[PDB]
Design an enzyme around this catalytic site. Structure first.
Site, mmCIF file in Angstrom:
data_model
loop_
_atom_site.group_PDB
_atom_site.id
_atom_site.type_symbol
_atom_site.label_atom_id
_atom_site.label_comp_id
_atom_site.label_asym_id
_atom_site.label_seq_id
_atom_site.Cartn_x
_atom_site.Cartn_y
_atom_site.Cartn_z
ATOM 1 C CE1 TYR A 51 -3.763 2.439 0.406
ATOM 2 C CE2 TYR A 51 -2.527 3.259 2.276
ATOM 3 C CZ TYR A 51 -3.564 3.397 1.380
ATOM 4 O OH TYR A 51 -4.395 4.498 1.461
ATOM 5 C CG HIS A 100 -7.588 4.936 -1.037
ATOM 6 N ND1 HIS A 100 -6.986 4.097 -0.131
ATOM 7 C CD2 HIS A 100 -8.836 4.441 -1.239
ATOM 8 C CE1 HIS A 100 -7.820 3.134 0.203
ATOM 9 N NE2 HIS A 100 -8.954 3.320 -0.452
#
Ligand code: COA
EC number: 2.3.1.258
Lengths: 4, 155
Positions: free
Chosen positions: B73, B112
């Site tokens: 991530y 994101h």
């Protein structure tokens, strides 16, 4: 872009 | 590879202050004394980016076990406006792709993005990431509050  | 003005460096207690200072200008959300404390322990996964020995960028990652998968991530990855479109972001992303590739055990990588971030989508799509979800009101207090989730498969 994390948060959160 | 040669004659390039761009180099990455390790983040250390000696320079973390400056990482913090760069994340504040580049990203609209502010990060807590935990985020930064954590990056000092992630090793190659937090790097400063320099252009002619000047810190103009940075990336911060984390390993994620979510969805019964091993996942990379990306929490932040950016560079000051005036230095964009010079290939700096590419340097940071590839560095991370390389780590994953050598390790061999990652299912995928992801991150994101505010749906308004058109340039980050052009960027990440170039590398093979796809939009796989659109979460509504992901961010708390910025506008817009919606976020795409981007992901590239490794396995
Ligand atoms: C996204 C971001 C990191 C790009 O980094 P960069 O160092 O400017 O990117 P690069 O110079 O390596 O660009 C690589 C390629 O991505 C694509 N790209 C990047 N920005 C683009 C834009 N604004 N328009 C069209 N294509 C773009 C291009 O194909 C580009 O290649 P080119 O420059 O040869 O056309 C940068 O714009 C940024 O700091 N954004 C704010 C931070 C952010 O929201 N990051 C999302 C991750 S959390």
């Amino acid at each position: 872009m994390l948060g959160p | 590879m040669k004659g390039s003005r761009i180099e990455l460096g390790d983040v250390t207690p000696h320079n973390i202050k400056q990482l913090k200072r760069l994340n504040q200008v580049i990203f609209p959300v502010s990060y807590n004394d935990k985020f930064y404390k954590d990056v000092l322990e992630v090793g190659e996964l937090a790097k400063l980016a320099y252009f002619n020995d000047i810190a103009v960028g940075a990336v911060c990652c984390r390993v994620d076990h979510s969805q019964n998968q091993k996942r990379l991530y990306i929490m932040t990855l950016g560079c000051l406006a005036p230095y964009r479109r010079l290939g700096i972001g590419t340097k940071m992303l590839n560095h991370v792709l390389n780590i994953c590739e050598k390790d061999g055990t990652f299912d995928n990588i992801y991150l994101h993005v505010q749906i308004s971030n058109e340039s980050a989508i052009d960027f990440y799509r170039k590398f093979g990431f796809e939009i796989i979800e659109t979460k509504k009101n992901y961010y708390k207090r910025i506008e817009p509050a919606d976020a795409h989730v981007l992901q590239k498969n490794l396995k």
